[PDB]
C-alpha cells in the first residue's frame, strides 16, 4: 500500500495546479464584476462614453500589472453594448475601440512593460483550428455561447511579435441575463510549465516527472520535456487514448509500468470545467 503514498502525493500536485488557476479565476471574476460596476456608474452618473472608454482602458492596464502571473487581459463588448456609441469611436485604438468602434481591448505583459491593442473584427471572427480542435476565437465565443466562465485548452496567440502558447480564463459580462461582452485572462503556458517543474521537486526531490494535460490531451507542462508543450499525449505516451478517456471521466488511475509507476490525477481548473490532469511518473526505485 505504497501505491497510496504516490496516490496521495498525486492529489497534492493536482491541488497545486487547481489553486494556481483558481487564483486567476478569482482575479478575473472580480475584474469582470468591476467592469460592470464602472459601466453602470456611467449610466447613473450620466457620463461621456469617451470618459468611460478612457478609464476602462486605464482600468484594464492597471489590473494586469497587479497580477505579474497574467500575460494579458482583454475586454470585448458586444457592438454598441457598453455606451451605445461605437460609431463615435471607429478606428480609435487608444480607447479600446476598433475598425467598427467596438470595445475590443487587449493589454499584454510579456516582460513589467505593458502594451495595448484593439482587436479588429477580422480577429474576433477568426475560427482557425488550434492544436486542439478549438476555434482560435474561443477566448470570446465560449463565454458568449455558454453564459459561463471557460478555461481553454492550450492555443497560440501573438503577444507582440512572437507566437506564444497560452491558456485563457474567459468570463461573461452579463447584464439582466444577456451576455453583453466578454473579459478574459491569458496565462503563458510557460508559467504552467514552471508550475510542472516546481511541483515535481516536491515529488520525491524531482527524481520523477510531472506533466499537466489539457482535456484535448495537450501538454500544458512537462517537468522533463518543455518541448512537449502544445503537443498531444501521443507524442510521448502512445501506449494515451486510455488516459485521455479516463481523464474526461474524472477518473484516477495508477499504472504498473516497467521500472516506474505512474498516476493520472484529474482536476477541475475552474468551477464547472472539463477535467484537466496531472500525469505523475516516479521511478519505482524511490
Automatic annotation (TrEMBL):
Organism in which the protein naturally occurs: Pseudomonas aeruginosa
Family statement drawn from the similarity comment of this UniProt entry: Belongs to the methyl-accepting chemotaxis (MCP) protein family.
Gene that specifies this protein: pctC_4
Name of protein: Chemotaxis transducer
Location(s) in or outside the cell: Cell membrane
Amino acid at each position: 500500500s505504497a501505491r497510496l503514498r504516490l496516490e496521495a502525493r498525486g492529489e497534492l500536485q493536482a491541488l497545486r495546479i487547481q489553486r494556481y488557476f483558481m487564483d486567476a479565476f478569482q482575479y478575473g471574476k472580480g475584474f469582470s464584476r468591476q467592469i460592470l460596476f464602472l459601466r453602470d456608474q456611467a449610466q447613473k452618473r450620466f457620463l461621456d462614453a469617451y470618459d468611460l472608454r478612457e478609464d476602462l482602458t486605464r482600468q484594464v492596464r492597471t489590473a494586469l500589472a497587479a497580477n505579474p502571473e497574467v500575460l494579458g487581459l482583454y475586454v470585448v463588448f458586444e457592438p454598441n453594448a457598453l455606451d451605445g456609441k461605437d460609431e463615435l469611436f471607429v478606428d480609435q485604438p487608444a480607447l479600446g475601440s476598433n475598425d467598427k468602434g467596438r470595445f475590443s481591448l487587449y493589454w499584454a505583459q510579456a516582460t513589467g512593460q505593458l502594451e495595448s491593442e484593439s482587436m479588429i473584427e477580422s480577429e474576433l471572427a477568426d475560427t482557425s483550428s488550434g492544436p486542439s480542435g478549438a476555434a482560435y476565437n474561443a477566448w470570446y465565443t465560449c463565454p458568449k455561447e455558454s453564459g459561463q466562465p471557460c478555461v481553454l485548452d492550450p492555443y497560440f496567440d501573438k503577444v507582440g511579435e512572437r507566437q506564444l502558447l497560452m491558456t485563457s480564463i474567459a468570463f461573461p459580462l452579463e447584464l439582466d441575463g444577456k451576455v453583453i461582452g466578454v473579459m478574459g485572462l491569458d496565462i503563458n503556458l510557460s508559467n504552467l510549465q514552471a508550475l510542472s517543474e516546481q511541483g515535481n521537486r516536491e515529488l520525491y526531490d524531482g527524481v520523477g516527472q510531472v506533466g499537466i494535460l489539457s482535456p484535448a490531451g495537450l501538454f500544458a507542462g512537462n517537468s522533463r520535456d518543455a518541448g512537449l508543450l502544445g503537443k498531444n499525449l501521443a507524442k510521448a505516451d502512445p501506449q494515451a487514448g486510455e488516459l485521455l478517456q479516463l481523464l474526461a471521466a474524472g477518473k484516477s488511475r495508477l499504472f504498473n509500468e516497467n521500472d516506474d509507476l505512474k498516476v493520472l490525477q484529474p482536476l477541475q481548473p475552474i468551477p464547472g470545467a472539463k477535467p484537466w490532469g496531472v500525469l505523475l511518473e516516479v521511478p519505482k526505485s524511490a
